[PDB]
Design a protein around this nucleic acid. Structure first.
Ligand SMILES: Nc1ncnc2c1ncn2[C@@H]1O[C@H](COP(=O)(O)OP(=O)(O)OP(O)(O)=S)[C@@H](O)[C@H]1O
Ligand SMILES: Nc1ncnc2c1ncn2[C@@H]1O[C@H](COP(=O)(O)OP(=O)(O)OP(O)(O)=S)[C@@H](O)[C@H]1O
Ligand SMILES: [Mg+2]
Ligand SMILES: [Mg+2]
Lengths: 318, 646
DNA sequence: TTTCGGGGGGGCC
DNA sequence: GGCCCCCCCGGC
DNA sequence: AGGGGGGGGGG
DNA sequence: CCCCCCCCCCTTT
């Protein structure tokens, strides 16, 4: 009862570059680099649950073989990465002497490099250049704009795309085959629908199902999983009549336990990206939503305020 | 055989899917694209034009050959076209043109000259490749000779392998490199003259240099090559070193007037190499001096004027406030982004040596992808060549889109882009979305609202709704600006409601611009609110000083003092000097003594009035003798003090 | 410019 | 080693 | 947007 | 030496 089982997200984390699904071109480039060598300074960008850290770790492992423990310096947001660290520890690591195969170099992995301050990034500049014949840098980030322009100039840009439904289904089917999990097509479709291109969320929900109810079907998935509330907000804001919008707001959001601040923020975000409505209408709707958001922030967060916001939105959209 | 002019004559001329042609069929013909083409977008049309080697010019000029014209063309475009009598064609005309030149040549001197230039570029690339392979061969021979009685050349970054070796191999910024070389080659003469014999170039007065430009243009490379070519020994400090006043005054300072032991022990057998014994200081990445380097900038500025050896500073952006101390203590050298015609032969040489095909016609596009970054374009070539052996027009679009450099815009650029009517149209809004506008605001969220408020009254709109006037749109924009100001006050409060920043983006910048979006009717002006606010703060502090210097004798607040008391104080203090001459002094002094007023308070009070009661001209017109006597009388007596130890 | 709160990086001791 | 101080962001 | 500056072409 | 395209860069606490 006191022993824990390894989650499938860690038990089936890809260990070779061939097992990473999606972004076929970039993965092929990384595989060929590993086959040949001469890894350059690179920055891998993307969104959560796509395989950036997995890609960097697999590349480093396959490149350095037995010398992984001596030629890889990994630092993330859980470690101190200030100006002093960059100027002493990373500099010493880059100046270190180590024997590696002909076309191999030491690797400095900076996971979540976006959080790094400007001073540390500036200090890294000449260090990445003076010792490029023995050390190479691999940054992994979610927001590339947080990395300063001089650092971006020195590295190769690798922007990852969101995993398509086909790739997520392929990896999920492999996991099911390995774990011998009974499933139905609708259950897998629901898992993909909730995943939104996030493989980590897909695997977590797949484990929660089976762990919770057993056979994977839409019924059990939706019993444990909730359809993303942004879609509900979009449906509410696109209703033809005020009655339908209020009905959706009550039944699907208010009675489900969602807070008013969450609802208004989601409405703002959804209205921002409604390409099927004119820009002026969206701007007026955003003005009304901002008024309601300010009212909620002041402390008056009630069903009546959201209903009034919906009524004003329908007034504008007429 | 076939002349371009004849084919153009055959094509119909306008008055005021596509077929595949042959390689370089449009070579030597300059094409300018204006308006909106129903079939191809601006980017797609430009790519199709560059496919055939045509040169695209952003502006219409007398040398222009043809100008494709569609719909929605600006008045300036039509005016230039009519003035310069330049032919224009339609989509069908361009389709016929792209297939009407099977001979890809045989035309006027323009095409022949373009072909000659292309051949010269190819020959230069071939010669560079030959020299590089010869250098590799001699290096291998030396290595073999050494081994008979360490870093592999295939294990180096392409940016290191093809780094410039001499100053003639650097692409672009020829003038800046020449200026730096001249400055460092005449440093001895300037030092002998105490840096006072300003030469024709004006570089003889500066003992320090400040190189500034965008990333990846060859600044550090140029500095190091210039220092090496002249024999100087290089001392370098980068951002990886803690360049604070404490350690700067204990480190590099001593080297400013000391010989180099390395130079003496390395050039002892050389002759005429005086510079070998001297130092050249290179401070790289001065703009990278963060809080970790306290007082370093001021110490560098002080050194710039008190250095006995040449000193070169390198920075990326020179126009920051933090770089003000170097205002007029160094010779400023600007390195601009190199043009796509400067690194062309270098790219052919790299392609030849690396055994991959790089069609020249797609080289230009790559330069725009990295915004003129040579390091970035070399890295892009190295990464793409890893799996793709051909860089042609069939895949350039994907590479360009996947390697786009996202540089945050500046206040003026943000204002220009956001006050443009194109993006707010249906098609423009479809391409440039509302999310993009909010991101453009967030690029600089502290100055975008002020710039928008400053520049929303100086545009000719193109988004006016039917029946609406410019004034009504301005009023609506002002109303939304006021609402955004209220939201801003709420954000910067005791509650720190930063979650409302996106809403502010829509209320302060996006919505008013969408209401008055159009074409700027004049120069974009910097926000005037900051200087006015500083002036208001200064005047309020002065008013408070006067109020607390006169509180004992007055019954009012600061506002009441300004609005009611000060005019009568003017009548009692300034008018007498204008009527009875010097005799007023005594009386005026008495009044000041009655309210614990000083000369500084007198000037401050005189500096408040506005409108018909401005005293600047009148005060200047006062006789000098009267003011001198007033000052003498004031300083010849003892006056009371309202507040002790102010 | 700018109303707290959190983080970093340096300066006394 | 510890206070004490100054400077700088804050949406997604 | 308007004005200054750098470099290739004609002259 | 003088002039004309073609674009870039800077206004900005
Ligand atoms: N392409 C993928 N193929 C297979 N599994 C993946 C893939 N991407 C993510 N996963 C799975 O999700 C888990 C986490 O993947 P990560 O590499 O940590 O994602 P990440 O993008 O690096 O996270 P961020 O950007 O720091 S929030 C992996 O252990 C895998 O089990
Ligand atoms: N004008 C150039 N000609 C040829 N190669 C260049 C040129 N500029 C940059 N490079 C290439 O990019 C590499 C780096 O050039 P750098 O001299 O470091 O540019 P930089 O402007 O000093 O970069 P910053 O300011 O530190 S971001 C060179 O070794 C070259 O390989
Ligand atoms: Mg990760
Ligand atoms: Mg540099």
């Amino acid at each position: 009862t006191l022993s824990l089982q390894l989650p499938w997200v860690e038990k089936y984390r890809p260990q070779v570059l061939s097992d990473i699904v999606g972004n076929k071109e970039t993965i092929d480039r990384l595989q060929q680099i590993a086959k040949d060598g001469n890894m350059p300074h690179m920055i891998i960008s993307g969104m959560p649950g796509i395989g950036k850290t997995t890609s960097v770790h697999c590349l480093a492992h396959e490149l350095l073989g037995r010398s992984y423990a001596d030629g890889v310096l990994e630092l993330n947001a859980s470690d101190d990465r200030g100006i002093d660290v960059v100027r002493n520890q990373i500099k010493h690591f880059a100046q270190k002497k180590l024997h590696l195969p002909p076309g191999k170099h030491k690797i400095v992995i900076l996971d979540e490099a976006d959080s790094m301050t400007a001073g540390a990034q500036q200090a890294l500049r000449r260090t990445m250049e003076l010792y490029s014949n023995s050390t190479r840098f691999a940054f992994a980030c979610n927001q590339s704009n947080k990395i300063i322009e001089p650092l971006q100039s020195r590295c190769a840009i690798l922007r990852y795309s969101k995993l398509s439904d086909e790739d997520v289904l392929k990896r999920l089917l492999q996991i099911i085959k390995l774990e011998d999990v009974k499933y139905t097509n609708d259950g897998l479709e629901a898992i993909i629908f909730t995943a939104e291109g996030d493989m980590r969320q897909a695997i977590n929900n797949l484990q929660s199902t089976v762990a919770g109810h057993g056979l994977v079907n839409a019924d059990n998935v939706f019993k444990i999983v909730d359809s993303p509330h942004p879609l509900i907000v979009k449906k509410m804001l696109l209703a033809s009549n005020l009655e339908d919008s209020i009905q959706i707001l009550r039944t699907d959001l208010w009675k489900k336990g969602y807070s008013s601040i969450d609802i208004v923020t989601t409405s703002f975000r959804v209205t921002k990206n409604l390409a099927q409505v004119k820009e002026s209408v969206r701007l007026e709707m955003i003005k009304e939503i901002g008024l309601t958001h300010m009212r909620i922030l002041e402390g008056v967060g009630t069903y009546l305020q959201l209903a009034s916001m919906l009524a004003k939105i329908h007034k504008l959209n007429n | 055989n076939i002349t371009a002019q004849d084919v153009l004559d055959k094509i119909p001329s306008l008055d005021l899917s596509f077929p595949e042609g042959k390689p370089n069929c449009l070579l030597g013909l300059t094409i300018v694209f204006t308006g909106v083409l129903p079939t191809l977008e601006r980017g797609a049309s430009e790519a199709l034009a560059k496919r055939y080697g045509a040169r695209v010019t952003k502006s219409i000029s007398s040398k222009t050959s043809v100008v494709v014209l569609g719909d929605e063309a600006g008045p300036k475009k039509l005016e230039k076209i009519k003035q310069l009598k330049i032919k224009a064609i339609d989509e069908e005309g361009f389709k016929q043109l792209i297939a009407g030149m099977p001979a890809e040549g045989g035309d006027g001197e323009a095409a022949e000259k373009a072909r000659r230039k292309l051949e010269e570029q190819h020959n230069i690339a071939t010669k560079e490749a030959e020299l590089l392979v010869k250098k590799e061969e001699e290096r291998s021979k030396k290595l073999a000779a050494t081994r008979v009685s360490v870093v592999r050349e295939e294990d180096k970054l392409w940016t290191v392998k093809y780094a410039p070796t001499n100053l003639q191999q650097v692409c672009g910024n020829k003038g800046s490199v020449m200026k730096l070389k001249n400055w460092l080659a005449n440093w001895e003469n300037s030092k002998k003259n105490s840096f006072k014999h300003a030469g024709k170039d004006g570089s003889g007065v500066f003992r320090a240099a400040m190189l500034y430009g965008p990333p990846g243009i060859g600044k550090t490379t140029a500095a190091h090559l210039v220092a090496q070519e002249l024999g100087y020994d290089i001392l370098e400090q980068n951002a990886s070193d803690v360049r604070s006043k404490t350690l700067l005054n204990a480190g590099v300072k001593n080297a400013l007037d000391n010989m180099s032991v390395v130079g003496y022990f390395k050039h002892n057998e050389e002759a005429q190499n005086l510079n070998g014994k001297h130092f050249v200081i290179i401070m790289d990445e001065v703009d990278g001096m963060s809080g970790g380097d306290r007082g370093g900038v001021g110490q560098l500025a002080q050194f710039c004027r008190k250095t006995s050896t040449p000193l070169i500073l390198i920075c990326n952006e020179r126009n920051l406030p933090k770089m003000r101390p170097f205002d007029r203590v160094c010779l400023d050298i600007q390195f601009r982004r190199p043009d796509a015609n400067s690194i062309k032969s270098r790219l052919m040489t790299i392609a030849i040596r690396e055994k991959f095909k790089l069609d020249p016609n797609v080289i230009d596009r790559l330069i725009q992808t990295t915004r003129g970054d040579i390091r970035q374009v070399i890295n892009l070539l190295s990464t793409i060549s890893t799996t793709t052996k051909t860089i042609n027009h069939e895949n350039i679009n994907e590479i360009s889109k996947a390697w786009e450099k996202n540089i945050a815009l500046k206040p003026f650029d943000i204002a220009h882009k956001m006050l443009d009517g194109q993006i707010y149209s249906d098609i423009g809004s479809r391409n440039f979305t509302l999310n993009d506008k909010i991101a453009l605001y967030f690029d600089d969220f502290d100055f975008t609202p002020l710039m928008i408020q400053e520049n929303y009254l100086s545009t000719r709109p193109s988004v006016l709704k039917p029946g609406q006037s410019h004034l009504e749109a301005v009023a609506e924009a002002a109303n939304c600006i006021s609402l955004g100001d209220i939201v801003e006050k709420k954000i910067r409060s005791s509650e720190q409601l930063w979650s409302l920043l996106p809403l502010h983006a829509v209320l302060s910048s996006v919505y008013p611009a969408s209401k008055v979006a159009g074409h700027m009717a004049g120069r974009i002006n910097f926000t005037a609110w900051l200087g006015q606010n500083s002036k208001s703060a200064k005047y309020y502090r002065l008013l408070q000083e006067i109020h607390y210097h006169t509180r004992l004798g007055t019954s009012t607040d600061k506002i009441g003092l300004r609005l009611d008391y000060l005019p009568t104080f003017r009548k009692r203090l300034l008018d007498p000097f204008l009527k009875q001459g010097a005799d007023a002094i005594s009386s005026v002094i008495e009044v000041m003594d009655d309210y614990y007023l000083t000369k500084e308070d007198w000037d401050s009070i005189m500096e408040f009035f506005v409108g018909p009661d401005v005293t600047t001209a009148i005060i200047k017109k006062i006789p000098a003798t009267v003011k001198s006597g007033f000052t003498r009388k004031y300083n010849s007596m003892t006056h009371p003090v309202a507040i002790y130890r102010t």
